[PDB]
Nucleic acid binder design. Structure first.
Ligand SMILES: [Zn+2]
Lengths: 97, 25, 217, 206, 115, 96, 32, 129, 87
RNA sequence: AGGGGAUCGAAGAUGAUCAGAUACCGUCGUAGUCUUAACCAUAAACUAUGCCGACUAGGGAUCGGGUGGUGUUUUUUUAAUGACCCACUCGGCACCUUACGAGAAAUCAAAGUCUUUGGGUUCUGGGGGGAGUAUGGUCGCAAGGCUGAAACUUAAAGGAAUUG
């Protein structure tokens, strides 16, 4: 049948979009597809905040952050747990948890 | 069988039929 | 020795309500069946179809029986009942119960000039229940009922005499064909007519009139 | 057709205005456009307290002159309405379904909560929409204290008050009890007020 | 573990519903009452009935239950409902601008203030 | 709507469309093309006299298991060698 | 078992067990 | 573009009667629309209509009164003789005692009963019941 | 409808919705009949004499039943200013 | 054909893996991927929903334009302007609730106004295969495209949804 009213993910008035490449397998997947997450992490993660604070010069200067825009294909996101299979009524909800 | 490779198999058969027609006039 | 549960049952046991006519006029919810057991004597049945149905379980194959039945007296009242039960005698019995719960009337009419106790339907009507349209056309006197045997028996139990029935869709499904004919009978009463264009002083709610005998004991 | 004493009675108008019934919601809805008077700035719509008053009087005409007064039913699940519907039950006939409705209460003749009313009042249609649906199954008229942004489906004569105000809900239930009593005939001398008083109908926290 | 079943809960709720005045707050007395006012056929079951009856009676004397209701409970719940407070004047009515426009459009005395 | 033309002078288009769709139909195409005369083993006839060339025993199709024991005959008026099933029991022994 | 004529099968068994309780009644009347 | 203004008018009337409205607004207008609605009004199927006359084609508001089950147009206007009127009324009237087939006749726009009485036939236009 | 002698047939005339003038079906279990009280001097609604309205299931389903009863109450004088003809 | 040739990379070279692996995995690598002038005319070219027109149900966002506001913030003393807010309107891509209706159902504000069958018009389909095959024509450097059967064979193939 037709599983989704958006045919998988939203295009709605283009016809064609430029594709990106998945970050785990480098599959060419369109930009309206290809689940996009923002990795906001620290270089000085919490197992070493006190270590670098006690071993750093320039006392209390800052702590830098790493920012990544990760495009996952459908197979890689399902395998790596970014996305989950849903029930029929729960597929209609599009609110972040 | 997959229809794509069925199309390819009939394509080879068409080429060989044309070749044997040209061979035997 | 039946006992009423509802206000309508209390009124009909008191015998103050004397007809399904004020029942259908005030569109009262039929919740029990003894009301028209007492009110519609000689309401004969006909079982139309007994059909097995199978649900696939873990290891077995659970087979229930589906009974579709009709009821009618001789003139202008039909009920259609569907029941699914493990025993087919119980299916027939409870289908009779459901058909009595679902008795509805018909608009009989004339094909031409009005002479002697209407024979056919009023208007050309239709009913659709799941890709089966059953269309009922009035017919001249003495032409009989032309239909498949099941629809013919339903209309014979209705008491019409002269119908042309057309039918489209998969008519081999007896349940949908009977349901389509049932909806066609309903729409036959539901149509509006220049005879019905006049205005009536609007009825007076016998439950409201007789609420003191309709109260709790 | 109504006599002159069925008007606003300004002495009851300050009850309405002080209970803050005149305010509505931020959404209008097409079946409640006639009830809306004006749009106050900062996104509030005001409800015509006059129009609420004659709709209340008409609903009193519906609720009164039911020949057996007990068959009227009062449905409540909002936490701001149980005490009000219990007091209305005490004063009038008014069998109460304060609390859970038990879906299958008007149909399903083998339930213990099997009531077959002749008139429903609902404290709030959106939060009690099961009872309105069941009345639609089994041929019962419905009175509702609707809002501007209320579901108008399957509902008869409605009185738009607030459904967001504790005081609004309680005082409208109180007023309806007042007028059904004064039309059925416990209270005479219509110019005189009522001994029972609205903060009795207002609920407590517990 | 020690979860009581539908048999003991159903019987205990019916007995407590229709026999509230004669029941007591002690297990020994209550189980003799169950012996007399119930034709129960099992001794251990009888003890279980009486134990859940006693626990539910403790909760009844502490407060109301959402499972069942009584005639004495009905009298006390009415009286606690018609507890009546004093009236909710501060001179004139409160601040009003366009609902004051509403009241002057309809026409009434209504001494009110502005916003 | 409905795709078909509805105007009062559209009967030419209606006739042309009907002729093409009739060519799509099965029985009409067989009749007009005359496969009864061009390609049928009979000459469009109900019956035909032939003479037996051989007696062939052919196995049934699944799930049935039997030998049907037909004959191979040659038609006199055409020459087309066809295969004819012999009817009820022992008539194979009757036919030589 | 025959799924498609169970209606007649059960009605025939209905007549049969009604008959069997009838001879039970007849035997009771003969003994008494 | 608009090919049959009567078809648009009758579609609007039919849709709003199914919706249960008491009145319709019809744009644009015609002599044939006015005369068809006049036959409707004379047989009582509709109530009263007002013709709003701007200097364009104009509009109509029709106050209905119920009792109009379905009104339909037959496109194209078919050349019906005096012997095919019975075929047409049997094809698309619900019963032989009510309903009218409206003909565009050289004597005027009228129903098939007045056509039978005046003994004159024409182009079939529509039908009401 | 009648016969040749004017003897009544049609065992029951149907009720008509007072909003859309449509036939109220026997199976229409949403269609409600409302009996409004007849008020004489200071209430005292005389028992047995009610102003009656009938609403059909279609009107209730589309949800314009409130608007229809505002209109009908104003037509029969039950209310004075609740429904404006020009929105 | 000419130029350009970094990356990736059909064919291929190898190293794995495997019972086999001229498959998936790893290293390189031809044509190609880029471009100028000519071709080809096919895609799950999909919204699997012809185009034009009218009507039928509510809502909230958004893009572009326009109207109204003794509205907000900005210059240097608060006007213009720009941006933002509110109300409305036209035209878009859509979205949410319901089912008035429609559907075999999934679902649909169109897939509605369809047995109460007719707004205008074009194309396509007639059980599954054989088969987009054979042949004939036409276009093409070819690759192939458009047009396009029959003999023969078969009682199913298939759509939606339910239970295991
Ligand atoms: Zn991937």
């Amino acid at each position: 049948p037709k599983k989704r009213a958006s045919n998988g993910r939203n295009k709605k008035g283009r016809g064609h979009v430029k594709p990106v490449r998945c970050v785990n397998c480098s599959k060419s997947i369109p930009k309206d597809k290809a689940i996009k997450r923002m990795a906001i992490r620290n270089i000085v993660e919490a197992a070493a905040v006190r270590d670098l604070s006690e071993a750093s010069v320039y006392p209390e200067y800052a702590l830098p952050k790493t920012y990544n825009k990760l495009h996952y294909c459908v197979s890689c996101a399902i395998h790596a747990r970014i996305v989950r299979v849903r029930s029929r009524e729960d597929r209609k909800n599009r609110a972040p948890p | 069988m997959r229809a794509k490779w069925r199309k390819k198999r009939t394509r080879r058969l068409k080429r060989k039929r044309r070749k044997v027609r040209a061979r035997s006039k | 020795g039946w006992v009423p549960v509802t206000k309508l049952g209390r009124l009909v046991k008191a015998g103050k309500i004397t007809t399904i006519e004020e029942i259908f006029l005030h569109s009262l919810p039929v919740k029990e069946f003894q009301i028209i057991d007492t009110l519609l004597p000689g309401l004969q049945d006909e079982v139309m179809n007994i059909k097995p149905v199978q649900k696939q379980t873990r290891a077995g194959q659970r087979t229930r029986f589906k009974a579709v039945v009709v009821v009618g007296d001789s003139n202008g009242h039909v009920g259609l009942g569907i029941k699914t039960a493990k025993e087919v005698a119980g299916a027939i019995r409870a289908g009779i119960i459901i058909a009595k719960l679902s008795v509805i009337p018909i608009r009989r009419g004339y094909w031409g000039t009005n002479l002697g106790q209407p024979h056919s339907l009023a208007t050309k009507t239709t009913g659709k229940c799941g890709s089966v349209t059953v269309r009922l056309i009035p017919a001249p006197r003495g032409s009989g009922i032309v239909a498949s045997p099941a629809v013919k028996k339903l209309l014979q139990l209705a008491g019409v005499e002269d119908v042309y029935t057309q039918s489209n869709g998969k008519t081999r499904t007896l349940e949908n064909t009977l349901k389509a004919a049932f909806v066609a009978i309903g729409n036959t009463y539901g149509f509006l007519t220049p005879n019905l264009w006049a205005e009536q002083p609007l009825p007076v709610s016998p439950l409201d009139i007789y609420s003191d005998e309709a109260s709790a004991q | 057709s109504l006599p002159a004493t069925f008007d606003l009675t300004p002495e009851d108008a300050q009850l309405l205005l002080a209970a803050n019934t005149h305010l509505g919601a931020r959404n209008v809805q097409v079946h409640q456009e006639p009830y809306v008077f004006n749009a106050r700035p900062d996104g509030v719509h005001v409800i015509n307290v006059g129009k609420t008053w004659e709709k209340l009087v008409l609903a009193a005409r519906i609720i009164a002159a039911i020949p057996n007064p007990e068959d009227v039913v009062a449905i409540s699940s909002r936490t701001f309405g149980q005490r009000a519907v219990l007091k209305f039950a005490a004063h009038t006939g008014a069998t109460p379904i304060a609390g859970r409705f038990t879906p299958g209460s008007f149909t399903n003749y083998i339930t213990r909560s099997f009531k077959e009313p002749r008139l429903v009042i609902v404290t709030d249609p959106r939060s009690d929409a099961q009872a309105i649906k069941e009345a639609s199954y089994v041929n019962i008229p419905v009175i509702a204290l609707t809002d501007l942004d209320s579901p108008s489906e399957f509902v008869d004569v409605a009185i738009p008050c607030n459904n967001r105000g504790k005081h609004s809900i309680g005082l409208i239930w109180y007023l309806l009890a007042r007028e059904v009593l004064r039309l059925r005939g416990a209270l005479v001398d219509r110019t005189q007020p009522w001994s029972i008083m609205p903060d009795l109908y207002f609920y407590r926290d517990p | 573990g020690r979860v009581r079943t539908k048999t003991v809960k159903r019987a205990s709720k019916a007995l407590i519903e229709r026999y509230y005045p004669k029941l007591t707050l002690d297990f020994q007395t209550n189980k003799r009452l169950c012996d007399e006012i119930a034709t129960i056929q099992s001794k251990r079951l009888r003890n279980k009935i009486a134990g859940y009856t006693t626990h539910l009676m403790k909760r009844i004397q502490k407060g109301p239950v959402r499972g069942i209701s009584f005639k004495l409970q009905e009298e006390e719940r009415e009286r606690k409902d018609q507890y009546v407070p004093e009236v909710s004047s501060n001179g004139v009515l409160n601040v009003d601008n366009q609902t004051s426009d509403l009241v002057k459009s309809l026409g009434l005395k209504l001494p009110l203030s502005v916003i | 709507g409905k795709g078909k033309p509805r105007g009062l002078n559209s009967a030419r288009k209606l006739r042309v469309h009907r002729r093409n769709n009739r060519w799509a139909e099965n029985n009409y195409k067989k009749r007009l093309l005359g496969t009864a005369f061009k390609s049928s083993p009979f000459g469009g006839s109900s019956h035909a006299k032939g003479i037996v060339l051989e007696k062939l025993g052919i196995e049934s199709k699944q799930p049935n298991s039997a030998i049907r024991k037909c004959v191979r005959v040659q038609l006199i008026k055409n020459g087309k060698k066809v295969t004819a099933f012999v009817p009820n029991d022992g008539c194979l022994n009757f036919v030589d | 078992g025959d799924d498609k004529k169970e209606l007649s099968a059960e009605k025939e068994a209905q007549a049969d067990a009604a008959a069997e309780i009838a001879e039970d009644a007849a035997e009771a009347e003969d003994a008494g | 573009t608009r090919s049959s203004v009567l078809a648009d008018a009758l579609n609007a009337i039919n849709n709003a009667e199914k919706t249960g409205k008491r009145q319709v607004l019809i744009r644009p207008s015609s002599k044939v629309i006015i005369k068809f609605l006049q036959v409707m009004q004379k047989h009582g199927y509709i109530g009263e209509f007002e013709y709003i006359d701007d200097h364009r084609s104009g509009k109509i508001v029709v106050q209905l009164n119920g009792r109009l089950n379905k009104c339909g147009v037959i496109s194209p206007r078919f050349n019906v003789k005096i012997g095919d009127i019975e075929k047409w009324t049997a094809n698309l009237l619900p019963a032989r005692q009510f309903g009218y087939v409206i003909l565009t006749t050289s004597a005027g726009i009228m129903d098939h009963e007045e056509a039978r009485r005046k003994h004159v036939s024409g182009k079939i236009l529509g039908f009401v019941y | 409808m009648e016969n040749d002698k004017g003897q009544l047939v049609e065992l029951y005339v149907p009720r008509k919705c007072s909003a859309t003038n449509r036939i109220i079906k026997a199976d229409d279990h949403a269609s409600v009949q409302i009996n409004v009280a007849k008020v004489d001097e200071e209430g005292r609604a005389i028992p047995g004499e009610y102003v009656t309205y009938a609403l059909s299931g279609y009107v209730r389903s589309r949800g314009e039943s409130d608007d229809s009863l505002n209109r009908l109450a104003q037509n029969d004088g039950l209310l004075k200013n609740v429904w404006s003809y020009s929105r």
